Design a protein around this ligand. Structure first.
Ligand SMILES: O[C@@H](c1ccccc1)[C@@H]1N(CC2CC2)[C@H]2CC[C@]1(O)CC2
Ligand SMILES: [Cl-]
Ligand SMILES: [Cl-]
Ligand SMILES: [Cl-]
Ligand SMILES: [Cl-]
Ligand SMILES: [Cl-]
Ligand SMILES: [Mg+2]
Length: 342
């Protein structure tokens, strides 16, 4: 049976939601409210999408977000508690609302004086969630401290999957400091190995308290990266598709890889070893999430019987060309077929 909905205007926005959601309070693409869910007892975040079907690009993006959130079922990844529309039919369908557990602090708000044990547990949880994500052939693309939610018990969830413009990535900006060089400069077709570079940048910052590659622009950032990991050899240069990018790289004086024990002074030697395996310029040679979980740095947390993989995820829609109303109808079907978690 369809629940009873109630209407209210909050901060010049109309919200029409099921009675189960009470005490709505604005907190922040879309608009977001905190609420109390009387069915589950959780405090929740409720997001009303802004203009979900205003263009082919926007309609496909709405479908993409709903498909991804419906699939993710893992302790270290954001999940979907509910999705609803007040519409009674496809003909009157206009608005989409998404519901998840309310999170209060990200990794920035946490990072305290972190012990090495704290770094072990936080990085372990990122890699456990990434093993799951990558097993479904999903690439996050935007891992950074503001996209990692952390609670009082140091438990962590990955959120805000890549679903960013040129201006957003320009200058002295945290939106670029965690990106792998091959994607920052469009060197080649990237893959899931981009996320491991980001994990290395995050782990370094938890150990030192400082951003690893805080470049003032794309070129300054590349210079900081190459000073640490070395300039590329002929093997990697062959993999860069742009002749212009290859010519630029070859204009730089050659540099050896630095000694990571003299950069990360005083850190656990096992942490230093893991950083050397994540921060490798050639993405083909980086450690994977599944391999990293078995590294000795995580010995007190690793349990191979409690590191699950995902159900298969069909992304064939990404190469499909449809009209606005066809993306809209596919989205409607996914709203009405949602089954809540236990
Ligand atoms: O996109 C928002 C969202 C809300 C409800 C369901 C699904 C997604 C997401 N929420 C997640 C809330 C759990 C904390 C926050 C505001 C913007 C943000 O992008 C990142 C932090
Ligand atoms: Cl209800
Ligand atoms: Cl509607
Ligand atoms: Cl950030
Ligand atoms: Cl040289
Ligand atoms: Cl699927
Ligand atoms: Mg974010």
């Amino acid at each position: 049976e369809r629940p009873t909905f109630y209407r209210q205007e909050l901060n010049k926005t109309i919200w029409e939601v099921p009675e189960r959601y009470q005490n709505l309070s604005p907190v922040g693409y879309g608009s977001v409210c905190a609420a109390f869910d009387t069915k589950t007892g959780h405090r929740v975040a409720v997001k009303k999408l802004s203009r979900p079907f205003q263009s082919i690009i926007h309609a496909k993006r709405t479908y993409r977000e709903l498909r991804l959130l419906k699939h993710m079922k893992h302790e270290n990844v954001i999940g979907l508690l509910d999705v609803f529309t007040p519409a009674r039919s496809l003909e009157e369908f206009n608005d989409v609302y998404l519901v998840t557990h309310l999170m209060g602090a990200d990794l920035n708000n946490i990072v305290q004086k972190l012990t090495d044990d704290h770094v072990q547990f936080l990085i372990y949880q990122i890699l456990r969630g990434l093993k799951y994500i990558h097993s479904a052939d999903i690439i996050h693309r935007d891992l950074k401290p503001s996209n990692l939610a952390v609670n009082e018990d140091c438990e962590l969830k990955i959120l805000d999957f890549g679903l960013h413009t040129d201006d957003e990535m320009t200058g002295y900006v945290a939106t670029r400091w965690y990106r792998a060089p091959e994607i920052m400069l469009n060197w080649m077709h990237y893959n899931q190995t981009v996320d491991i570079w980001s994990v290395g940048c995050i782990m370094a910052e938890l150990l030192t308290g400082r951003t690893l590659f805080p470049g003032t622009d794309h070129i300054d950032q590349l210079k900081l990266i190459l000073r640490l990991v070395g300039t590329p050899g002929a093997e990697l240069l062959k993999k860069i598709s742009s002749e212009s990018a290859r010519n630029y790289i070859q204009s730089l004086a050659q540099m050896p890889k630095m000694n990571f024990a003299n950069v990360f002074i005083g850190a656990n030697p096992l942490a230093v070893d893991l950083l050397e395996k994540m921060l490798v310029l050639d993405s083909d040679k980086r450690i994977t999430a599944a391999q990293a979980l078995a590294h000795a740095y995580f010995a007190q947390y690793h349990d191979p019987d409690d590191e699950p993989v995902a159900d298969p995820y069909d992304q064939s829609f990404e190469s499909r060309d449809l009209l606005i109303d066809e993306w809209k109808s596919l989205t409607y079907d996914e709203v009405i077929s949602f089954v809540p978690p236990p």
